[PDB]
Amino acid sequence: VKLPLPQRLLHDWANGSWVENISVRPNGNLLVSTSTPDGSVWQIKEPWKDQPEVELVYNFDQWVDRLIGIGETTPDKYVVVGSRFYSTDPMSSHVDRTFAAMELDFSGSANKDKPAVRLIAWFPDAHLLQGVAALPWDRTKVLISDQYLLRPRAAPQKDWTPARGQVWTLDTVTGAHEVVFANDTALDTTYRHGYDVGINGIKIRRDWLYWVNSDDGNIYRLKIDKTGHAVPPAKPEVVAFQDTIWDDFTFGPEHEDTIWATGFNAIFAASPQGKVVTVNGVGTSDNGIMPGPTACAFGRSPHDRNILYVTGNMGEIPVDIEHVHLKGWVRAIDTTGFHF
Ligand SMILES: *[C@@H]1O[C@H](CO)[C@@H](O[C@@H]2O[C@H](CO)[C@@H](O[C@@H]3O[C@H](CO[C@H]4O[C@H](CO[C@H]5O[C@H](CO)[C@@H](O)[C@H](O)[C@@H]5O[C@H]5O[C@H](CO)[C@@H](O)[C@H](O)[C@@H]5O)[C@@H](O)[C@H](O)[C@@H]4O)[C@@H](O)[C@H](O[C@H]4O[C@H](CO)[C@@H](O)[C@H](O)[C@@H]4O)[C@@H]3O)[C@H](O)[C@H]2NC(C)=O)[C@H](O)[C@H]1NC(C)=O
Ligand SMILES: *[C@@H]1O[C@H](CO)[C@@H](O[C@@H]2O[C@H](CO)[C@@H](O[C@@H]3O[C@H](CO[C@H]4O[C@H](CO[C@H]5O[C@H](CO)[C@@H](O)[C@H](O)[C@@H]5O)[C@@H](O)[C@H](O[C@H]5O[C@H](CO)[C@@H](O)[C@H](O)[C@@H]5O)[C@@H]4O)[C@@H](O)[C@H](O)[C@@H]3O)[C@H](O)[C@H]2NC(C)=O)[C@H](O)[C@H]1NC(C)=O
Ligand SMILES: [Ca+2]
């Protein structure tokens, strides 16, 4: 195919806003989580339209100031994670011990339009919950990645000591949660890429936990058992490398095991043998048209499965992480005909 892939803008939010992650509903609508100015889920209805309707689903202020990740559990139910944050500044740290997991339930006829929302569990001993992925064989349970500052504080943040990365399981029926994998440098950051996270987005495919690390360039996978624990010898495997700040990723389209991952102001495709290609954004003729991509997911309707919907949070190409211009957006990239 010709690169860069075709792309179009679906929607911009206001200056100061930040769209952080995305889940596509069985009906094809997009659900996106925001981190600023508030922790909300917005829906983009019928996103294949030139001008789709964009509507607030729910502001989770009762429990949190920001949302981070979203992931589907059982059909048309979703878990979001979030916490309180010291400010809406782009560099604000979270407030320690305030993380939570909450549920949006669109299942059933009463909830199909307006979901039922609830608090699932508080996570006061987590550091920063990030990505959410259901166990494919038991979708009422999710894994949740967890990494950022060990001692987050009000600005100015001075002690940037990172907590070691870890992965939680959460039973959304009972609310029970525990750490299932921790203490591996593949989960960690040493700020090789500047202040950032180690493990960031996660997905689960067959019996493999996959994740990207935002500091060391690697996409990893780990063999897991039925409860989410590493099968011994519990050693992560590098599946791909690129010297870029990853954020989140997906497999697709449909059944393909290509990884489509967001990196630094650019979008990448990664073959299962580790070949990485820049398909959109910086490093293509797109240049700076999509600054700050944060996550991506393929369409689910019969007529847009090859469309990769991409969330992002910058209105201009950032260089200094301390002087960025946040602006949430969602774009759509047509991957039709891409192959290695
Ligand atoms: C992955 O690897 C990690 C690292 O090993 C594992 O985590 C450890 O798990 C241990 C076992 O569960 C935990 O041990 C328990 O600790 C409890 C107290 O935890 C509280 O305090 C600690 C220490 O806080 C000090 O140090 C911090 C780090 O330097 C610092 O940020 C903090 O401010 C504190 O500093 C002050 O104090 C130190 C002296 O310690 C001074 O040096 C310093 O200057 C300051 O004045 C903290 O890390 C933790 O967050 C928490 O706040 C104890 O209460 C437990 O004791 C009970 O149980 C014991 C049996 O285990 C028993 O003997 C005892 O009688 C009690 O009944 C217990 O010792 C440990 O906290 C974890 N450490 C870390 C760093 O997280 C982890 O489990 C591994 N993961 C997996 C999945 O395997
Ligand atoms: C949402 O936030 C927006 C910021 O992200 C904000 O838009 C900004 O508004 C301010 C004031 O309203 C404008 O400030 C004015 O800038 C002009 C000069 O503008 C020209 O130069 C600037 C800076 O150029 C240098 O820096 C850039 C990167 O920083 C380099 O690439 C470059 O090489 C230079 O060294 C540049 O940002 C401008 O670009 C915009 O405008 C042109 C058309 O004029 C477009 O082609 C371009 O794509 C872009 O839209 C421009 O070339 C100066 O003379 C004035 O004194 C004043 O300082 C900002 O330019 C503007 N920035 C952007 C990116 O739009 C929105 O107003 C805000 N919205 C709301 C509702 O608040
Ligand atoms: Ca992320």
- Please indicate the percent range of residues in DSSP E strands (runs of 2 or more): over 45%
Radius of gyration, taken over Cα atoms and rounded to an integer in Å = 18 Å
CATH superfamily caption = TolB, C-terminal domain
Q: State the domain count.
A: 1
Instruction: Outline the biggest β-sheet.
Output: 4 strands, antiparallel
CATH architectural group: 6 Propeller
Topology-level CATH name? Neuraminidase
CATH class category label = Mainly Beta
Cross-sheet strand order for the largest sheet: 1-24-23-22
Helix content percent band: under 10%
PDB class: biosynthetic protein
Keywords: Diels-Alderase, biosynthetic protein
Assembly: monomeric
Entry title: Crystal structure of Diels-Alderase PycR1
Structure write-up:
The chain is mainly beta and about 350 residues long. The chain has a single domain (about 5-335), classed as TolB, C-terminal domain (Neuraminidase), CATH 2.120.10. The protein contains no helices and 24 strands. The strands form 6 sheets. It has a 4-stranded antiparallel beta sheet with strand order 1-24-23-22, with no helix packed on it. Strands 2-3-4-5 form a 4-stranded antiparallel beta sheet, with no helix packed on it. The structure holds a molecule of 7 linked components (NAG-NAG-BMA-MAN-MAN-MAN-MAN), a molecule of 6 linked components (NAG-NAG-BMA-MAN-MAN-MAN) and calcium ion.
